[PDB]
Specification:
The structure is a homohexamer of 317-residue chains. Chain A has 317 residues and is of the alpha/beta class. Chain A has one domain: Alpha/Beta hydrolase fold, catalytic domain (Rossmann fold, 3-Layer(aba) Sandwich), CATH 3.40.50. The first copy, chain A, has a 9-stranded mixed beta sheet with strand order 1-2-3-5-4-6-7-8-9, sandwiched between helices. In chain A, helix 10 links the parallel strand 8 and strand 9. The radius of gyration of chain A is 19 Å and the shape is globular. Chains in contact: A-B, A-C, A-E, A-F, B-C, B-D, B-E, C-D, C-F, D-E, D-F, E-F. Chains A and B meet through loops of A and loops of B.
Chain lengths: 317, 317, 317, 317, 317, 317
């Protein structure tokens, strides 16, 4: 791939007007209240894995809609308390629950939980499908903020932080949230909705500036939205869909983030176009940094791995 | 594309061993009993459409899991009773609820209902997502026959027939079930599970001979199963998944079909490979015909449209 | 595919200077005189089709160059006179002479003739091939307006209207011309060259703004022209080719259209780029409407089908 | 691309049954008689080209259907008589009439004429288009041997030989016929139908074993036939089409070739599959050689250029 | 991608005849003698990396042709001696010298050196380019076993083991060699040529059964060989190239491996086709295991990571 | 492909600032001095080829780093002295040493030598590989001007001219240098560094305006540089690489060319983008002409062959 979006000079200035509706704050207050209604009831079960110096567990907990959320939790095999991370996986990109990555993060010294995103990686989704949607999860329940797929998952992410904070081996003051793409969005959304994380690291975050994303993305999954409008052509439906999407859009949630945050984008990224990620970054008002990589797209960026290891070490270890 | 599957001579003889488990019949008896528990409660609402000689309605009814199923119902604007069709749409292939096709079928003289497949085209799916699945609907709830996506939809198809049969303008003895791909499978499954349809037309039916399909298909959506196995590598998971799939596989349901049926396949079809469709055809023991089209794949086949119009006319008009 | 052409704001203003030569009107007067020289001599032969309420015929007639033009003609099976439609098919896109579509139009109440475009769908082309051309019909005879492929075709379209107008079951005052792509161009060209049609519907019309078309189209068939220039590199050949194309270009013919017309374009259309279709539309001076579909390309647009059915009903039924 | 057709061991034995109809010989006798009816009337006009030691001319002549056939004729600029070559170009593959290649052949010592294939490279085609065909020339007039595109072309190739044989600077006993793909087929067909050529060189000849070609070819242009059947689905059309094709098929003409012939195939050729070329070769009963190139497809094969230069030198220089 | 190679049942029995020349052993004896001539002269320089519990160094050493070979060496930050790994990277697949992976292996408890393959990753290649080759390294110096690219690299791998064995913090009896693809071949070749490694892990090993690989591979880099033969068509060149390749082919080296070895293949692997990897496996005579993954190709296989971690733990930790 | 780069109007004015470092001239002076140190020691060996009127030889000579450079040398078989050409082949595009083209040039009247580019077509490269590089030759030794791949190559080209100038059958005052792509760059570079050539012809020259090329090219091989930066992410590496490239960039060498030069570009060229070629052209200060071809990309342009034949005839024959 080659550069296709706004020039770097324009990207640095790109700050689209917020799409937040008047009841944006209220919706999240109400949603968090519904979460609080559900007792977490976490369970831990040891899980054999071929590694020395780390103990691995299957963690489950109850979340929004009485959904049982799961993932692996790996802890350094030494006396705590430990700094912690909740790691969020990419869209349709969880293979064997990310167990190898989670263990590696524990080997770096972090008690780390890889939350499996409901329906994708390995957690329950109790929310009904209200009607038609395009292939995938992006448009499931899109005709109402109350039914939208990411409502439950954002709340699950907040609950993950509430659960790991409650563990005696975890230092509640040294928790980080990390992820790439979908995972980056969940990291930012969790930090926006919760006091618990000290620090955020987000590789090319998804779920940002939807109204531009649909016009600029050249690959899935933003284009599921386009697919949805093709199948449901009522102009009223498009209006409603963008209305519901605004409640989950990082350009609206970013302003609530108070934590130091580190982000990355590759300038040839066709999945999360640079403009969408700069849009999120430019709405942050916090200790922030955006690493820009000219020659990379939506993929592992080796140089950024070192940046993120240094950043987490600085703030948590 | 070009020929890729078994030669025509081998296709004609291809009849794989049934994969039906000992409780196959019992599962469907139990599932039909759960359907019967739900009162249909159908509603009709007139819908304005630019056509003379047809009245159009939005039809809803209650089905398995208390799910509200919907679709357009178009009726010839003349004194009944009328022959009727329940038309089932393709996988992720419902655009504006197929309204134009449904109206056209009514213009041909058939009271026709286009059932929207839960979550795809525009009906509710109340069934929970028990855990992880691949992008799409093919692996939703795949770890149990009781939770699997197509359980609800097959039952919805039966209920569609029960509802349209109850209408006073419909001749209950002249009802046909039709569809292509996913729609063709729903047509066959509905006829296998219900006495109501007089006749079946299935273009290149999907959901057939799963164990071969996963090894021979070159396009989506059978490959969602492959995707699922890549993400969930436990050998026990693959065993369990094929066990649940067997309850919905047309090679196992086909033997229950007593209605005259007409089917089509194109020999270059990469979505529903010819071998999988011949497998279904060769397990039918009924008045049957399979039209074979050398130069067509998974697509509208003009020559077959004339065959199917003649067949429906013969048996219903 | 994504947005690639001029922005919507620019498209609305795009009105390229006409390329019509001084003898534009004279060329068409002369060509219509040559048509008039040929006696139509139409023949009708009944054709069996599995439909109630419509009679189908094979229609033939003589046209420019004593070419025998053909197509199916379907008539509502009831007392006339009937409104009528001449339907024109897409480039290389006639399968079994569009019989199913033609019958469906008759079921909607229109006596309809699907003119098969000479050499493509099933009519005779008596015009000689004067020399080399690129693969396809776009550059056949392109070195002279007198020999160019579309001269005979445009005249066949006019003759189609003259023939159906002569039928006693047809109301001569309620004839419409319709088609998509190539078909949309033939519809507009027919209305420009003939008084007979009352109304025009053209889905993303082809043969428009050739000089821009060859620089912006990303798919066939405008690129046959590029192919031709690659093979025949004389600068005088390119000049001559664009000269002859100007006589058939919709930006030059559009000003002659006096009928109410309805048009459609999808903003991601790579075959008939939006700018080329807006160019044609913006040269119309008549009761006109252009429906714009952000998420569609060169394909069936369900929402537009409802628009066109309402428009034809309003003006013809 | 990789190996896809029969193994080499099977290719060497592949000799499909001839498809020649009982009136095969008679058809060609009649067709040659119709050619004979047209007086050649050749014209030569000098043409400036930047080369020393060669004189270039534009040659025209009259052929079947009173079509004016053309091409460049290049002669060594020295006292004759000269050996000669008629060179036939590939399908839709004539750029600026192949002038540079033609001049190069003259520099190698051959009076050479590059016959432009009617409608493709730059010759007239007077034959009418009787009805519909797929995009391209392969199915033009395919419903009758008398109207089929290649009838005139084959006859033009014979007439080319008759014209160059009449030139005083040409040694009538040292004429070769050469070409690749379509050109290879014209070379073989010309040698089958005419005494005049002394030798034949055919790179991966086209128009061979049509009934297999349509099932094994992976790239155009054999697939135009498939395209044709898709648009015209009557079983009696497919029968008729293969009947007409049989008259032009190299497996039926090959047996008439008495000249030494040299052929080439690449084993990864997707346009003219190896089996189709071996089929032609194995029906030759003459001094013959087939050069097989494992690593080449439908393209220039440098090693074969040396083989063909040696072969022409041996037999002609 | 789908299944394309031999069936699993055939793969298990596929054991192609060895292509080893009579001087195979002598060539390696002589090559190892030339290596021994070069004094290692290793250097270590500390390298800052954001990790606790591991110290990282840049390691260099001298090897065949007095080439300076380099890579990162990461050691657990605790009292030794430690088990060790030499890790070999994939073809053209070294990004920032694989530092993050190397550190992670050290966190798992292994003193690990990632040897950079000369010219690719970051080591010197003193060997001259004797003549033409295809784009890449696969055919560099291919006309002689003495000049061939992999001669130096295999010897570098042996020297890597000699160097890390000399370190006082390394337990010489607990050294493993690991890698995928090119790296898997280097691991196997190193174990074949050296006593030092206790155990081998090779993911889908490359450089195996060249004469089949060139006929079955569908992606790069085996196809560089095909590319080379296209450019250099002398039959003696192809003979000579396969002669030199035989000295480096795993089917010839595998018989020298005495260490327990674990291998993996994915059945849809288009880069290292399953037959080529089974060929290498079936020529091993040692404590061996081959893990077969139906749904994976040439990529990270999560299930195999757990197998390889268990295997290394069992034999080394 | 379609137009993608700057508009023609902007291309004509595109003249990027030179990137030449202060020691640009000195580097080339020093490099030419190192060349002069190596005695040419040319050898000629007759080579059998099937052509009359031309004698072919294998020519070798010694060049920079004591590398033996080779290629075919073809001479008109008549009394000299002859005008001469040094022909340079494309990147990875030498098949059987271009022998057929070389012979054809000799048939046009030119004593012609096709220099084989070290490592690619068939010459020795003695220069070491100092460290890692991307797949290909573009980044070999890129971290220093002294080690960079094209240093030896440019010097080989100069030495080629020195060798053929020394031949008694060659008129030293009528030597031209020609090539396309890589070959065009070598032609221009040779003329910039040497007095010997009278005239230059360069089809779409490569190695021009590197800093833009990496951002605009859509195909290989410029993108090897991008590949290199992906693998070696140090910002200092990118700086150093572009510094090195500046010494070989045609925008910096072009100003030294005093010979009449003819160049070509196709406006849809994705390999050597039009802007990069216009950049080189606009830095020439000499008798120059640029032929622009709207409908061609990186390929043989038939119309330009006639231009180049006329130009060489005018200046050399």
């Amino acid at each position: 791939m080659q550069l296709f979006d706004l020039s770097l000079e324009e990207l640095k200035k790109y700050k689209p007007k917020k799409t937040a509706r008047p009841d944006f704050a209220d919706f999240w207050k109400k949603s968090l209240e519904e979460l609080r209604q559900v007792e977490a009831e976490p369970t831990l079960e040891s899980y054999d894995y071929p590694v020395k110096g780390v103990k691995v567990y299957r963690l489950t907990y109850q979340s929004f809609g009485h959904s049982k959320i799961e993932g692996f939790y790996a802890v350094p095999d030494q006396t705590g308390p430990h700094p912690a991370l909740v790691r969020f996986h990419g869209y349709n990109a969880s293979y064997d629950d990310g167990i190898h990555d989670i263990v590696n993060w524990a080997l770096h010294g972090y008690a780390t939980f890889g939350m499996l995103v409901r329906g994708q990686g390995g957690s329950e989704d109790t929310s009904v499908t209200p009607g038609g949607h395009a292939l995938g999860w992006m448009t499931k329940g899109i005709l109402s903020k109350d039914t939208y797929y990411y409502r439950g998952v954002y709340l699950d992410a907040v609950r993950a932080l509430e659960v790991i904070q409650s563990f005696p081996e975890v230092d509640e003051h040294r928790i980080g949230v990390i992820g790439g793409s979908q995972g980056g969005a969940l990291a930012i959304a969790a930090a926006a909705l919760s006091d618990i994380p000290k620090v955020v690291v987000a590789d090319y975050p998804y779920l940002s500036n939807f109204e531009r994303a649909v016009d600029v993305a050249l690959e899935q999954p933003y284009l599921e939205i386009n697919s949805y409008f093709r199948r449901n052509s009522d102009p009223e439906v498009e209006e409603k869909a963008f209305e519901t999407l605004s409640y989950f859009d990082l350009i609206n949630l970013a302003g609530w983030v108070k934590q130091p945050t580190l982000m990355a984008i590759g300038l040839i990224d066709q999945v999360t176009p640079p403009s969408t990620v700069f849009a999120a970054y430019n709405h942050l008002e916090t200790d922030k940094e955006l690493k820009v990589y000219r020659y990379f797209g939506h993929e592992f960026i080796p140089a950024f791995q070192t940046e993120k290891l240094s950043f987490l070490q600085k703030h948590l270890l």
